[PDB]
Amino acid sequence: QKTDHFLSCYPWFHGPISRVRAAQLVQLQGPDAHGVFLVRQSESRRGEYVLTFNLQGRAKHLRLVLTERGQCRVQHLHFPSVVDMLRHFQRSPIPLECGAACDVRLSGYVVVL
């Protein structure tokens, strides 16, 4: 789409891949890939996006809402851009509802073909 064209310049953006495929992409290297992520379109909420990431070998999926100006909303958090959101979660942990055993910072990413 129009919003998805500027995301298409990033190596970690995979566009319209399914939940299952994205999970397997981030899970491929097992717990060695803790923190590895990608960004895709949501298949269940058209127009919205998803950050799929590896948490100690398992895939997690977090909704991302992009505003008209490209600001990124993650529930209660707000970021000027998707890139700022990624850089934030590379240096502070993702405050997931499963708390303690769910400690993760973003590391690398799965490169789109």
Binding site: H61, L62, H76, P95, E97
Partner: peptide, 5 residues
């Protein structure tokens, strides 16, 4: 879909 706290 994960929920933040």
């Amino acid at each position: 879909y994960e929920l933040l706290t």
